[PDB]
């Protein structure tokens, strides 16, 4: 029964230590600032495309 | 009635020796056989959890 408890807490480990390293590319945090980033610069081309 | 008593003695003290020789011969082969069952489950029990 301690086993349960190890074997279940290593298998969570191991699903943090998968989402650590991917978060750049996974995470909505990372994947929202690379958005802001692009929508900024949509924001700003638009407004070239019509003041041309 | 001394002799009495002292055969009622012996009628109690046997019957609790008889008990005690047969009842611990029971007991250790009980749990023995919830060992031989524990090993079934830890090894089933981590199967399972490998699984997951």
Same mark, same amino acid.
């Given at each position: 029964?301690?086993?349960?408890? +190890?074997?279940?807490?290593? @298998?969570?480990?191991?699903?943090?230590?998968?989402?650590?390293?991917?978060?750049? +590319?996974?995470?909505?945090?990372? @994947?929202?600032?690379?958005?802001?980033?692009?929508?900024?610069?949509?924001?700003? @081309?638009?407004?070239?495309?019509?003041?041309? | 009635?001394?002799?009495?008593?002292?055969?009622?003695? %012996?009628?109690?003290?046997? =019957?609790?020796?008889?008990?005690?020789?047969? =009842?611990?011969? %029971?007991?250790?082969?009980?749990?023995?056989? %919830? =060992?031989?069952?524990?090993?079934?489950?830890?090894? %089933?029990?981590?199967?399972?959890?490998?699984?997951?």
């Amino acid at each position: 029964e301690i086993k349960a408890e +190890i074997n279940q807490k290593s @298998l969570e480990l191991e699903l943090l230590r998968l989402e650590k390293e991917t978060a750049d +590319i996974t995470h909505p945090l990372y @994947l929202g600032q690379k958005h802001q980033a692009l929508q900024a610069m949509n924001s700003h @081309l638009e407004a070239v495309l019509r003041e041309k | 009635m001394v002799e009495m008593i002292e055969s009622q003695t %012996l009628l109690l003290t046997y =019957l609790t020796i008889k008990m005690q020789k047969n =009842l611990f011969r %029971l007991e250790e082969k009980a749990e023995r056989n %919830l =060992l031989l069952v524990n090993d079934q489950k830890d090894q %089933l029990q981590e199967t399972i959890h490998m699984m997951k």
